[PDB]
Design a binder for this molecule. Sequence first.
Ligand SMILES: *[C@@H]1O[C@H](CO)[C@@H](O[C@@H]2O[C@H](CO)[C@@H](O[C@@H]3O[C@H](CO[C@H]4O[C@H](CO)[C@@H](O)[C@H](O[C@H]5O[C@H](CO)[C@@H](O)[C@H](O)[C@@H]5O[C@H]5O[C@H](CO)[C@@H](O)[C@H](O)[C@@H]5O)[C@@H]4O)[C@@H](O)[C@H](O[C@H]4O[C@H](CO)[C@@H](O)[C@H](O)[C@@H]4O[C@H]4O[C@H](CO)[C@@H](O)[C@H](O)[C@@H]4O)[C@@H]3O)[C@H](O)[C@H]2NC(C)=O)[C@H](O)[C@H]1NC(C)=O
Ligand code: Y3K
Ligand code: CA
Ligand code: CA
Ligand code: CL
Ligand code: K
Ligand code: NA
Ligand code: ZN
Length: 802
Amino acid sequence: WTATSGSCKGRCFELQEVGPPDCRCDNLCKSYSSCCHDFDELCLKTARGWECTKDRCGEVRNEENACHCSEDCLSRGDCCTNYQVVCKGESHWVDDDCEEIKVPECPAGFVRPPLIIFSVDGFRASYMKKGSKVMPNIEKLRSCGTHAPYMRPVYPTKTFPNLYTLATGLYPESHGIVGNSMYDPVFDASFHLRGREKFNHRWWGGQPLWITATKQGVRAGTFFWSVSIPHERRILTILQWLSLPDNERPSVYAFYSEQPDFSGHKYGPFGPEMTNPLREIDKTVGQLMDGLKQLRLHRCVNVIFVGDHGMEDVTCDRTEFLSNYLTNVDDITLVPGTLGRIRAKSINNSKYDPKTIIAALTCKKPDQHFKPYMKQHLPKRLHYANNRRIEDIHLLVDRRWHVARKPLDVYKKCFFQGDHGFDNKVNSMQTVFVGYGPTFKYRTKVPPFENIELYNVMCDLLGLKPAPNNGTHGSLNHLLRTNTFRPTMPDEVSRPNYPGIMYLQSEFDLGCTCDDNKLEELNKRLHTKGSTKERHLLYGRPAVLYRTSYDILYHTDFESGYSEIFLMPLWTSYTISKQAEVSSIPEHLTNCVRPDVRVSPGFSQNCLAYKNDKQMSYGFLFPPYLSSSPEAKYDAFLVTNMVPMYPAFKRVWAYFQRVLVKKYASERNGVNVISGPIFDYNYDGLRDTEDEIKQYVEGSSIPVPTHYYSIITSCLDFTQPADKCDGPLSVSSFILPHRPDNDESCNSSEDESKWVEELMKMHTARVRDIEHLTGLDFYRKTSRSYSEILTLKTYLHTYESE
Ligand SMILES: *[C@@H]1O[C@H](CO)[C@@H](O[C@@H]2O[C@H](CO)[C@@H](O[C@@H]3O[C@H](CO[C@H]4O[C@H](CO)[C@@H](O)[C@H](O[C@H]5O[C@H](CO)[C@@H](O)[C@H](O)[C@@H]5O[C@H]5O[C@H](CO)[C@@H](O)[C@H](O)[C@@H]5O)[C@@H]4O)[C@@H](O)[C@H](O[C@H]4O[C@H](CO)[C@@H](O)[C@H](O)[C@@H]4O[C@H]4O[C@H](CO)[C@@H](O)[C@H](O)[C@@H]4O)[C@@H]3O)[C@H](O)[C@H]2NC(C)=O)[C@H](O)[C@H]1NC(C)=O
Ligand SMILES: Cn1c(=O)[nH]c2ccc(C(=O)N3C[C@H]4CCN(C(=O)c5cc(OCC6CCOCC6)nc(C6CC6)c5)CC[C@H]4C3)cc21
Ligand SMILES: [Ca+2]
Ligand SMILES: [Ca+2]
Ligand SMILES: [Cl-]
Ligand SMILES: [K+]
Ligand code: NA
Ligand SMILES: [Zn+2]
């Protein structure tokens, strides 16, 4: 109940929203049916349109007008945005040459440059080029400010998840808005686009920018607009707030456009009907920039133009139906569309089995346009698992497709030609970033980056300390002229031991077997002391950022940090030059596993547990195939280079090691590789402690990794060998799930050359993802600036064309 009896006179677009039942005059009041009776009349004036004309110039102020062309309008701060152009012979902002903004040029009394965030729903990254003729204002922001060729959204590439990630710097799994539609089993409530429940505060985790600003004494403009308030009125309101006295004036403002998403759904991302919404967005930016120029604020304000996600071609006929796969289709609830989430229709049905649902959905039709996953098996790069609102069963849908439960669902709701929500690496889902203002660089292109990074930059732009978030603070320093955040490397928590030869062969009872001069006796000793370590450890050793017990182990071909707790390396580092040659494992060595005389029996794995364990086999982190000499090859068979691997995963791993590593070395002019295991049993994206481990090799204390990573670094200028690189580096990485089958790869009964590399590409990763997952910190010793290294660690090789 609102007692909507009060008035909006002098209260129009009030910045602090007043408590019910007293009636509201804020920019959100409509969406709560809480506006005062006079709201439309006083606050949503429309009389005479949105532009001055020759004859309106110098008029006597008529308060009924939408915007004013009277002499006093400037001081009052309510001129039509084109006032100085029509009435005072000024040019539109878009027609002025760009001129570097070296310092904020602000009115007296501004304590900091304001920030205006202009967000555009569904503005696909390629619109910047493809619509450039019809967007002259946006193009001036882009070419004159700082821009990326695209910005990567989060998954799912839906509106609420993305806008809330922009607000908070958090993955959907951490901020809680994991979809446009949601069921929270703890609350026993549902969240939908339509309706009331989405307003409840308990959905919305982390700390969004407006709250971060308020808590630190920076005033925030209300970010949210009732959809019926026209764009022109939103702009005029922002311009008005900017004319408030110093003590009342917000420092941050948000404009949101429903376009071009709204049209893109009806017409497809490139439908001829898409030109007009692009034109209309540009005209709005034009009104903002003209308005700012009138207030002499156009070289004072920082402007961010940002989208939430792109838009792909999707139609009704491209729908897969679960009723074509599942005989039990009525015992499940499906969250449908460009992704799928499945749970039980009723928690009192004890015969609902997720395992058989997955199996009934796996590789069933030759061209199947979705792939089922238990959520913990989704690519770790999506960070989409650690929230009770995310159903155990997930369908990753092919771009251009929909999944639905039954055909009735589709023709009882073709309506649409565009949709979004797909995997966030998909090109059609990429969106835009442009920054313009005194704090951004001038005419600068930056590489693509993820929207999780922006909250930190918006905090930097406002002088705020950001709440804990998933950006890597400093990785976007190269967007900024000043206000950079200068981080230190985290301190190493555990120092390693450097064990020498301490154990006799006969002390080892591991059930392991191996059929195995003074010049090269001193030589092998110096290799064990770390003489080739500068060849194999190019960027320093990784720092261990938690308390644990580990050893550095040197060898001719590789260096490793061996964990006495997990009985295996945390990391193994080796360099493969362009010249290097693949040899095979000789037969006298096929099942060779050798005790490592530097490491006690008690901190070692044993062959017997592998023999006993009928499901589990073993692989090696340094590949024997790439040993530098037959003598060095013995080092690769050390029990300390051994890790648990399912036979089905060995197919993957062997092909990577035997074929792909050499291929990358030829193509990249040497590669440095760091490989190791990952334990993420509770799927939170963070290194597990030992008491979190759910699986061991039968009858032993050997813990089973959930994933295996590799980080493959070379010189960005590939005319220089990886081990002799003078400048910036180039990286690609992966986090492969360690799975007892290859059900994920539909063509896996074929030759590894037809499916392994595609699987690795699917599970591409940022070094930073690996850092979270291992508690390690990489590239500690390079000659590059730390900010540049943070940028490299956030890089994701996506394997999408141009
Ligand atoms: C991305 O960045 C984010 C932000 O940095 C990272 O997430 C953080 O990770 C931290 C480490 O896991 C986590 O720290 C925990 O905090 C607990 C206190 O939590 C509350 O307070 C904070 C601060 O204001 C608040 O933000 C939290 O909000 C969460 O919860 C509500 C839902 O209830 C949501 O509104 C909100 O969306 C958010 O949910 C998300 O986080 C939780 C985990 O906290 C998930 O479970 C959800 O699915 C969702 O993803 C909270 O309101 C604190 O209790 C924890 O302490 C336990 O563990 C430590 C180890 O240090 C130990 O000292 C303690 O004893 C304690 O254990 C006790 O409780 C256990 C659990 O009940 C119990 O089993 C034990 O026996 C013990 O008695 C812990 O310190 C932090 O909260 C989140 N922050 C956010 C915002 O998510 C994230 O990791 C990054 N991602 C990646 C990949 O890097
Ligand atoms: C059906 N469906 C789709 O498939 N795509 C859709 C797209 C839109 C709609 C729709 O009309 N809506 C009607 C509403 C329109 C108004 N909105 C906001 O004011 C808003 C802004 C906003 O900014 C956050 C800033 C943070 C700083 O960085 C820039 C962005 N944060 C939110 C929510 C997250 C807190 C909502 C969008 C949401 C609704 C969505 C419905 C859709
Ligand atoms: Ca959207
Ligand atoms: Ca974990
Ligand atoms: Cl959703
Ligand atoms: K076995
Ligand atoms: Na398969
Ligand atoms: Zn949409």
